[PDB]
Amino acid sequence: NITLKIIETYLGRVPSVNEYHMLKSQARNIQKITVFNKDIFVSLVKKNKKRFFSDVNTSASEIKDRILSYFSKQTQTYNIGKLFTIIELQSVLVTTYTDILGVLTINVTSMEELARDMLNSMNVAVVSSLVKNVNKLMEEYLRRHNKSCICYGSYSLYLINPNIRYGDIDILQTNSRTFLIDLAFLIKFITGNNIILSKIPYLRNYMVIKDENDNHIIDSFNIRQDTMNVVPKIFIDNIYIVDPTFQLLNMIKMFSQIDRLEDLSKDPEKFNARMATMLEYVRYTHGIVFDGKRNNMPMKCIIDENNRIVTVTTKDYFSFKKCLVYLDENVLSSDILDLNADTSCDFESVTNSVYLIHDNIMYTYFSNTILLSDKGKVHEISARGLCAHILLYQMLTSGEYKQCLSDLLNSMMNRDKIPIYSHTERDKKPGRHGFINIEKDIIVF
């Protein structure tokens, strides 16, 4: 009974048989939408526009119409699928906008030489202005959501060393989708331009907001509370950043990816600054001494090219004899199931792989290309990457890693460039390119 009156008011007409049946169950969320005060919202969006998008020339009247138009576009939509979409998106705003965007309105230069030395030895290969605005908004965001949003990459290092230049702000969140939907709407309302949210298959729990012209605006990686709780973090300027120690470890694993080394050669200077900043931090923070001395590091890595598995002899540094590193995640997943192992530690995009210790053998997957110095021989750059990949696990589990990290860095010193003979390809990751198209009332995953 009351359901019909809810639906009729929402649709601004009398529900057809089919419509009352289809929307019947959403009666609750629909009422929340109708009851929501649309005036305070217009006020909120405007207030936001002045603090973060003053340079956007649009009428407060222009904003109002866009908004009120959206909260009534059900009254003009008859396709049930489109209706389900509008109700879903509207609810996200009604239930989360205030908490998410609403709240928003109230020693290095010494290590530079060491950095060059390390990087040069590895050098052996061969976007809308809305970002300026969004960037400044994220600066505040990181401060009001310390528990659900953490930063890494350039910006996080810039907070340590103001000399660092950053193009965007990299973040991990426990609520990416809600956040991205809220932000997409905010931009839509202020700007008037149709942004699209899309999900990328080969990235884990990844979503990005692109403008009307496919220009990158902002992206985010989703992680569960479990993961967020174990990620090594540091408190800086009222914001959490991924521990620079952990980021250093990921940088080392990153140089194993062919594309990244190619970036290193294009502009070596870019990496010197970030490298140096992290080296500095570690030396000061962990009392790590940088003498070209570090044994057993680059711990033997043997490739079995046919099965695409790199064996890493780890018995010198860890309890498990060796670590089998798979290059095909589906093969790893299937092999772990064969072992009847149900509790492999997962850290999602943070490590882009599960880690399992079974019968004192670690099983894991490596998401970057493996560089080779010769036929069937792993290039020392990838060996350090593999080693770094294992150390990420040590960090995520409060295990020992300090000495090994010291050994890893020291092994990067006084090195002669070794050319890249070849490299393995990454495994293909199937899946569709999903997206949310607000103006077209379409959600496809």
Partner: protein, 288 residues
């Protein structure tokens, strides 16, 4: 008396380390929904853990009425896992599955033609298949074989990254001929009927290699004996070293399944988490 202590319950058929000759002479409300809920929650959680659930389309064949599926759907939805559910059955599903943008309800009996149709439609979506197809007493061996032939057809056409298939080996004394099934782990099911020999074959596919293994009458003898031992001896025991409100084997088994499930609420101990999940599940299924 008739209690026992174990380090863990038998999670897969291959673990059962004993047998008993079956004997022809061999309780909870909505226990069948609990059986499917636990097994699927377990299966999907494993896929979430290993990163294959992320952005997948879960194609469920023979899912009606599927009341329990509404629980799975909210669980993952609340964990922020993006999933597209496609529920297919010759019969209608429970109404609580209606009015959800992320779940498509299809009423129709599947055949080769239809399978090819949705594969074209879903492509390039990563597909996860769950089959609980039936066909009234106990199914004949001929019906079961027809069923396994169809499940194989589903796999070969849909090319899923992972699957959970209903698996109950024809009884020895009712053998027709040998047949094939995908390689995989045969997950035991807590809360299944008292003498059920049914299990869930879980597979994670490796590229274009559908691995097919033969099932023989000899394997049937083994399935019947292992399961009889498990149903007659093991499942009737109270686990003494299992510190839980209910020390029944089935609850012990359930605990090892639910302990692998993710929850964004934080608990002090695993026990506290499993307790919460169990209550949440029983509450949802209307089980006291």
């Amino acid at each position: 008396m008739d209690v026992v202590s174990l380090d863990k319950p038998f999670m897969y058929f291959e673990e059962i380390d004993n047998e008993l000759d079956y004997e022809p002479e061999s309780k909870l409300p909505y226990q069948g929904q609990l059986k499917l809920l636990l097994g699927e929650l377990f299966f999907l959680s494993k896929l979430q853990r290993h990163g294959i659930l992320d952005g997948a389309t879960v194609v469920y064949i023979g899912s009606a009425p599927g009341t329990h599926i509404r629980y799975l759907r909210d669980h993952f939805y609340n964990l922020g896992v993006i999933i597209k559910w496609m529920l297919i059955d010759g019969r209608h599903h429970d109404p609580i599955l209606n009015g959800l943008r992320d779940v498509t309800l299809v009423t129709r009996f599947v055949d080769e033609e239809y399978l090819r149709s949705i594969k074209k439609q879903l492509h390039p979506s990563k597909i996860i298949l769950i089959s609980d197809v039936a066909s009234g007493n106990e199914p004949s061996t001929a019906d079961l074989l027809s069923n396994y032939a169809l499940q194989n057809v589903m796999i070969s056409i849909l090319n899923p990254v992972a699957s959970s298939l209903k698996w109950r080996c024809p009884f020895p004394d009712q053998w027709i001929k040998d047949f094939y099934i995908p390689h995989g782990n045969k997950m035991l099911q807590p809360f299944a009927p008292s003498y059920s020999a049914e299990m869930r074959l879980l597979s994670i596919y490796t590229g274009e290699n559908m691995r097919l293994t033969r099932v023989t009458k000899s394997d049937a003898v083994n399935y019947e004996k292992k399961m009889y031992y498990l149903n007659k001896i093991v499942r009737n025991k109270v686990v003494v070293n299992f510190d839980y409100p209910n020390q029944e084997y089935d609850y012990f088994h359930m605990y090892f399944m639910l302990r692998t499930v993710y929850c964004n609420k934080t608990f002090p101990t695993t026990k506290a988490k499993v307790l919460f999940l169990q209550q949440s599940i029983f509450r949802f299924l209307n089980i006291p």
